[PDB]
């Protein structure tokens, strides 16, 4: 019998981490593995039906995706949906699959709202989610003694899936929930020179521990401006929330060869970069090789190296986790459409996949690991100094390296005389 | 053969102008008329299948409505959808019906966005729409010589269909488009005493011709505060955007018997009320009688008098207009599922219904008539002095009455020395 998987992803646009040009070969690799395991899905064959989350303009849409999901549902009666990856596309589709009582698996849709499973019943996220970034920051603040305040600056592109907004929204709610610190925040538009005076003023007025979600160039410009304004590593720390490591390729993220590298290097003495952790089990490197090969040969697409590859790898691992859950359900006398039973076997469970160890929490979302990159004083090069395990919630040093603090130890998150020092008797020096 | 009409409306909640307790009897009345007209729908019988736009909490929802529409579509293959009425419910349903190429008729969903028919293809609105309010204001400003500025203040209830927001959004875009005046605007929360200082300051600083969308009590309080601050009818005019005439029951909207009626009457010398026009053809009064009777006997609901009744009357008239369009389509050899052909016969067309004359514009939206209520100097009572025909776009005086201006003529929309008079030489007096 056929186990039909309904896919709703960007079938023609290849620019997303979850675009079919990347996810398609990853899924094919997972299915080829299933076919070679007679113990898996005894008596069933996995079949795929494809639908696109894209509108006429070629971008993931909050309307095209649900229209596609309904069409697939009606025509093929799928047992499970794979995707969408975009937050705006997955929100409406997930409400339909919940209503239909059909599981939905995705390594995308990291937004806070998708985490409300009373609404998104049967939605299992096998990739990163933004509230998990909040868990990492919570751990960082506790380890460094920051219990009072932080500022978050962020920018996105006019009409996209608003990645930075959702990153900050998840970080904000979770950090506020666990640390109860004041979290000031504000958006800006990267190409608007009018916003720089406001940002620099907000940095001085509202925070000492600062998080910035922006392009690599916007972060570098802000650091150069901070250095020129005399905001150094003794009093400030700037964390670039660069989950996919776009500013990384030794790593010298401050280098451009534009006549400002000496200043940029100096300015980065006060910066650290937060990224998803690069899987480092040997099975991942082999998957990457097979992924690139198949993507090139059967999907006409060149898959470049980078952290974005954890997404298709997570669709691969998630589909295998689902397969295991269904195999166990059949074994116990249930069937492939027992949505609740199958989902219950995926949540609050560990699994070994190409991305290594992976744990799905009790709310149906995968625990996410992060890496903190810091500067090597001697060379100015950046390297990972701390890794965060999202399951144990422990921060572990890497290679005996210690965190770099320009003049000693971490700056306090509140200035000696407060942010709005109005006490003539308090000497800020 | 059966012509199936899929309904997606509030089936259990009776508080909406488009709730089934009101719309259901209105539709029944229209169907009984069709059954008595053998010339209509030769060989077809209209059948109704019902779905609710309500979520578990009993309010119209942006999710329950489309889930219901899909369920109805699948199970009954309807030829046309009736409803939703709520803006948040109709937006997603309309995108589905457009995709399915099935007509959607509604006397609700007045929001600006629903007017983009490239998206909401086949959606025909037979009731009021908010951009039409913009047409009325345009006409008013031209007649009174207001070519520069206006201020709009508005408030809604925490999680409703945000009626005032959509009213102002439609007014703003259309007025800006046709007059190119500056339109300042701002929201407030009615029960928050903290907002009154800000509102009164914005009135002084930003406008002389002011529009307010709020509850009857919030408008009265604002008028009493304006009078106390010395803002009179010589320099200010306050238009209460009360489309359904909630502040009306002679009409003395300023009366409460709370010890402030003398002041309230005086304060209202500077106020006028904008409402939808009450249909005044004899067929409307008879429809109202039949509606109340049937609603009480078959739907267990007491239909009170009021302008909200134009909504069920417009679902009644719209369904008959649709019937006429389909009858003509059949006559020409087409069939009940020729969505485009049927819709084309409804747009840019006049029709006679219980609400009297009704014209559907070229964009598929009904032209809306409005009434302006003004104070009678002698009694302080309010009465209609001007009526606006949305098709001809002409303003016509009623009963030889003229507009009331406390001290002569309309106040100018810009103060003599400008809003921020900084010219020491200009005497505001
Ligand atoms: C594929 O997706 C990308 C990203 O969404 C599209 O690029 C954007 O296109 C929109 C138009 O809808 C522009 O307003 C943005 O400036 C573009 N942003 C980025 C980051 O590229 C792209 O056009 C889509 N289509 C194709 C064929 O690639
Ligand atoms: C992250 O931390 C968790 C600790 O809970 C590690 O999970 C354990 O992994 C071992 C070996 O895979 C299992 O035998 C245990 O059952 C796991 N414990 C739990 C509670 O699930 C996990 O290995 C760590 N991740 C990495 C990359 O080291
Ligand atoms: C029917 O609809 C009304 C209006 O939407 C509901 O009343 C609101 O209920 C919400 C809860 O979802 C409250 O937050 C609001 O304060 C209420 N506003 C108003 C104007 O009533 C009502 O509860 C719904 N259900 C029923 C049975 O009437
Ligand atoms: C609103 O104005 C329009 C003027 O265009 C009136 O419409 C005319 O109505 C008469 C009688 O019903 C028809 O013979 C004409 O064909 C209509 N003209 C057009 C252009 O459609 C309409 O009657 C007015 N409304 C009211 C209540 O008087
Ligand atoms: C959270 O901390 C702030 C001060 O940092 C305090 O005012 C507030 O009361 C705390 N939260 C709660 C729920 O008390
Ligand atoms: C609209 O009017 C304003 C001043 O009232 C003017 O500055 C503006 O240029 C006008 N619109 C356009 C498109 O020129
Ligand atoms: Cl997607
Ligand atoms: Cl509705």
Curated annotation (Swiss-Prot), chains A, B:
| Cysteine-cysteine disulfides | 60-86, 164-213, 417-426
Q: Which residues are glycosylated?
A: 13, 180, 300, 341, 348, 389
Residue ranges in the Extracellular topological domain are 1-429
The organism sits in which domain of life? Answer: Eukaryota
What does its PTM field state? Phosphorylation of the protein kinase-like domain is required for full activation by ANP.
Where is chloride annotated to bind? 53, 85-86
Where does it localize? Membrane
- Relate the protein's function as given in its record: Receptor for the atrial natriuretic peptide NPPA/ANP and the brain natriuretic peptide NPPB/BNP which are potent vasoactive hormones playing a key role in cardiovascular homeostasis. Plays an essential role in the regulation of endothelial cell senescence and vascular aging. Upon activation by ANP or BNP, stimulates the production of cyclic guanosine monophosphate (cGMP) that promotes vascular tone and volume homeostasis by activation of protein kinase cGMP-dependent 1/PRKG1 and subsequently PRKAA1, thereby controlling blood pressure and maintaining cardiovascular homeostasis.
Q: Which family does it belong to?
A: Belongs to the adenylyl cyclase class-4/guanylyl cyclase family.
Q: Relate the assembly described in the record.
A: Homodimer.
Name assigned to this protein: Atrial natriuretic peptide receptor 1
Q: What is the lineage of its organism?
A: Eukaryota, Metazoa, Chordata, Craniata, Vertebrata
């Amino acid at each position: 019998s056929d186990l039909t998987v309904a896919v709703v992803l960007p079938l023609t646009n290849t620019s997303y981490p979850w675009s079919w040009a990347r996810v398609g070969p990853a899924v094919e690799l997972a299915l080829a593995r299933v076919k070679a395991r007679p113990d898996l899905l005894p008596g069933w064959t996995v079949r795929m039906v494809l639908g696109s989350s894209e509108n006429a303009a070629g971008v993931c849409s909050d309307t095209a995706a649900p229209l596609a999901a309904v069409d697939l549902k009606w025509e093929h009666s799928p047992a499970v949906f794979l995707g969408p990856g975009c937050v705006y596309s997955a929100a409406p589709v997930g409400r339909f699959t919940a209503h239909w009582r059909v599981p939905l698996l995705t390594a995308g849709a990291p937004a806070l709202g998708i985490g409300v499973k009373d609404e998104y019943a049967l939605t299992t996220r096998t990739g990163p989610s933004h509230v998990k970034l909040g868990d990492f920051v919570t751990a960082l603040h506790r380890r460094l003694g920051w219990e009072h305040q932080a500022l978050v600056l962020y920018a996105d592109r006019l009409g996209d899936d608003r990645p930075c907004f959702f990153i900050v929204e998840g970080l904000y709610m979770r950090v506020r929930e666990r640390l109860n610190i004041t979290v000031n925040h504000q958006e800006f538009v990267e190409g608007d020179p009018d916003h720089y005076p406001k940002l620099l003023r907000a940095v001085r007025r509202k925070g000492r521990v600062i998080y910035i979600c922006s392009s690599p160039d916007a972060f570098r410009n802000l650091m150069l401006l901070a250095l020129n304004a005399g905001l150094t590593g003794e009093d400030y720390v700037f964390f670039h929330l660069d989950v996919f490591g776009q500013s990384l390729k030794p790593q010298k993220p401050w280098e451009r060869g534009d006549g400002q590298d000496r200043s940029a290097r100096q300015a980065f003495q006060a910066a650290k970069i937060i990224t998803y952790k690069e899987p480092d089990n040997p099975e991942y490197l082999e998957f990457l090789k097979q992924l690139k090969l198949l993507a090139d040969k059967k999907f006409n697409f060149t898959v470049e190296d980078g952290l974005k590859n954890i997404i298709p790898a997570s669709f691969h691992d998630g589909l295998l986790l689902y397969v295991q859950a269904v195999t166990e359900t059949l074994a116990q006398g249930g069937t492939v459409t027992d949505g609740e039973n199958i989902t219950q076997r995926m949540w609050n469970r560990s699994f070994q996949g190409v991305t290594g160890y992976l744990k799905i929490d009790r709310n149906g979302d995968r625990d996410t690991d992060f890496s903190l990159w810091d500067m090597d004083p001697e060379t100015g090069a950046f390297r990972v100094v701390l890794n965060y395990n999202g399951t144990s919630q422990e921060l572990m040093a890497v290679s005996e390296h210690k965190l770099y603090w320009p003049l000693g130890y971490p700056p306090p998150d509140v200035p000696k005389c407060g942010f709005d020092n109005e006490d003539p008797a308090c000497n800020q020096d």
